[PDB]
Design an enzyme around this catalytic site. Structure first.
Site, PDB file in Angstrom:
ATOM      1  N   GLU A 180       0.838  -1.209   0.000  1.00  7.55           N
ATOM      2  CA  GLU A 180       0.000   0.000   0.000  1.00  7.55           C
ATOM      3  C   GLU A 180       0.864   1.247   0.000  1.00  7.55           C
ATOM      4  O   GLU A 180       0.533   2.200  -0.723  1.00  7.55           O
ATOM      5  CB  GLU A 180      -0.905   0.004   1.211  1.00  7.55           C
ATOM      6  CG  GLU A 180      -2.011  -1.001   1.166  1.00  7.55           C
ATOM      7  CD  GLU A 180      -3.027  -0.764   0.071  1.00  7.55           C
ATOM      8  OE1 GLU A 180      -2.982   0.320  -0.566  1.00  7.55           O
ATOM      9  OE2 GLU A 180      -3.903  -1.650  -0.166  1.00  7.55           O
ATOM     10  N   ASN A 190      -7.708   9.034  -5.657  1.00 16.38           N
ATOM     11  CA  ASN A 190      -8.569   8.139  -6.379  1.00 16.38           C
ATOM     12  C   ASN A 190      -9.385   8.889  -7.426  1.00 16.38           C
ATOM     13  O   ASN A 190      -9.590  10.084  -7.353  1.00 16.38           O
ATOM     14  CB  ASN A 190      -9.491   7.454  -5.367  1.00 16.38           C
ATOM     15  CG  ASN A 190      -8.742   6.751  -4.230  1.00 16.38           C
ATOM     16  OD1 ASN A 190      -9.148   6.860  -3.053  1.00 16.38           O
ATOM     17  ND2 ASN A 190      -7.764   6.043  -4.553  1.00 16.38           N
ATOM     18  N   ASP A 197     -12.464   9.026  -8.054  1.00 25.94           N
ATOM     19  CA  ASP A 197     -13.650   9.684  -7.499  1.00 25.94           C
ATOM     20  C   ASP A 197     -13.370  10.916  -6.684  1.00 25.94           C
ATOM     21  O   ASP A 197     -14.347  11.534  -6.294  1.00 25.94           O
ATOM     22  CB  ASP A 197     -14.513   8.687  -6.729  1.00 25.94           C
ATOM     23  CG  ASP A 197     -13.861   8.196  -5.447  1.00 25.94           C
ATOM     24  OD1 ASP A 197     -12.801   8.639  -5.038  1.00 25.94           O
ATOM     25  OD2 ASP A 197     -14.519   7.412  -4.728  1.00 25.94           O
ATOM     26  N   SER A 222     -11.780  11.073  -3.801  1.00 24.41           N
ATOM     27  CA  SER A 222     -11.254  10.673  -2.472  1.00 24.41           C
ATOM     28  C   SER A 222      -9.769  10.480  -2.543  1.00 24.41           C
ATOM     29  O   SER A 222      -9.174  10.456  -3.608  1.00 24.41           O
ATOM     30  CB  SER A 222     -11.943   9.400  -1.977  1.00 24.41           C
ATOM     31  OG  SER A 222     -11.615   8.283  -2.783  1.00 24.41           O
ATOM     32  N   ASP A 272      -6.379   8.306  -0.477  1.00 18.55           N
ATOM     33  CA  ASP A 272      -5.892   7.306   0.469  1.00 18.55           C
ATOM     34  C   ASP A 272      -4.633   7.829   1.182  1.00 18.55           C
ATOM     35  O   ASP A 272      -3.767   8.438   0.580  1.00 18.55           O
ATOM     36  CB  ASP A 272      -5.516   6.030  -0.253  1.00 18.55           C
ATOM     37  CG  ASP A 272      -6.656   5.332  -0.896  1.00 18.55           C
ATOM     38  OD1 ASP A 272      -7.831   5.566  -0.622  1.00 18.55           O
ATOM     39  OD2 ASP A 272      -6.341   4.409  -1.694  1.00 18.55           O
ATOM     40  N   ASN A 325      -8.890   5.268   3.135  1.00 20.52           N
ATOM     41  CA  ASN A 325      -9.608   6.122   2.171  1.00 20.52           C
ATOM     42  C   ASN A 325     -10.570   7.136   2.841  1.00 20.52           C
ATOM     43  O   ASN A 325     -11.428   6.752   3.623  1.00 20.52           O
ATOM     44  CB  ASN A 325     -10.371   5.198   1.197  1.00 20.52           C
ATOM     45  CG  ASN A 325     -10.999   5.954   0.033  1.00 20.52           C
ATOM     46  OD1 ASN A 325     -12.082   6.459   0.155  1.00 20.52           O
ATOM     47  ND2 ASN A 325     -10.333   6.046  -1.048  1.00 20.52           N
ATOM     48  N   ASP A 343     -15.214  -4.736   9.527  1.00 19.37           N
ATOM     49  CA  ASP A 343     -16.471  -4.312   8.943  1.00 19.37           C
ATOM     50  C   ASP A 343     -17.184  -5.345   8.073  1.00 19.37           C
ATOM     51  O   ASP A 343     -18.236  -5.035   7.511  1.00 19.37           O
ATOM     52  CB  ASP A 343     -16.362  -2.986   8.220  1.00 19.37           C
ATOM     53  CG  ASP A 343     -15.762  -3.102   6.855  1.00 19.37           C
ATOM     54  OD1 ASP A 343     -15.515  -4.278   6.402  1.00 19.37           O
ATOM     55  OD2 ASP A 343     -15.480  -2.047   6.210  1.00 19.37           O
TER      56      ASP A 343
END
Length: 129
Positions: A35, A46, A48, A50, A52, A59, A101
């Site tokens: 990562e 990203n 969209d 957003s 990270d 994110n 999650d």
């Protein structure tokens, strides 16, 4: 901060990440390797809009607030800049939420594609743990 491999392994263990949700320490070190290359200051934008952040590329769409991801959530209740610190506590605390999650470590695309199914203990081999 750019951690060394065995150095990050020790910090993640201290912070309770080892075996968290059934994921051995090598899984977490391998995820951080791919990562962020162990760099706490890593950021990636990203498609969209957003971003990270940090050693586990958490994110802003869901987990942290950066003020620049309209419509996003802040489920870790933290500024995304917290996830860039030399001290990994905020990143570990939030990663514990994410891995809980439902989807386990599949939340981290680099883990699915580059660590899952591999000899992840290699990432902690030889470390004084």
């Amino acid at each position: 901060k750019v951690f060394g491999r065995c150095e990050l392994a020790a910090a993640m263990k201290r912070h309770g990440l080892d075996n968290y949700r059934g994921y051995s320490l090598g899984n977490w070190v391998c995820a951080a390797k791919f990562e962020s290359n162990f760099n706490t200051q890593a950021t990636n934008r990203n498609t969209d809009g957003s971003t990270d952040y940090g050693i586990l590329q958490i994110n802003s769409r869901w987990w942290c607030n950066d003020g620049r991801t309209p419509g996003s959530r802040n489920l870790c209740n933290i500024p995304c800049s917290a996830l860039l610190s030399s001290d990994i506590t905020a990143s570990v605390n939030c990663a514990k939420k994410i891995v809980s999650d439902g989807n386990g470590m599949n939340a981290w695309v680099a883990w699915r594609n580059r660590c899952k199914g591999t000899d992840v203990q290699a990432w902690i081999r030889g470390c004084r743990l």
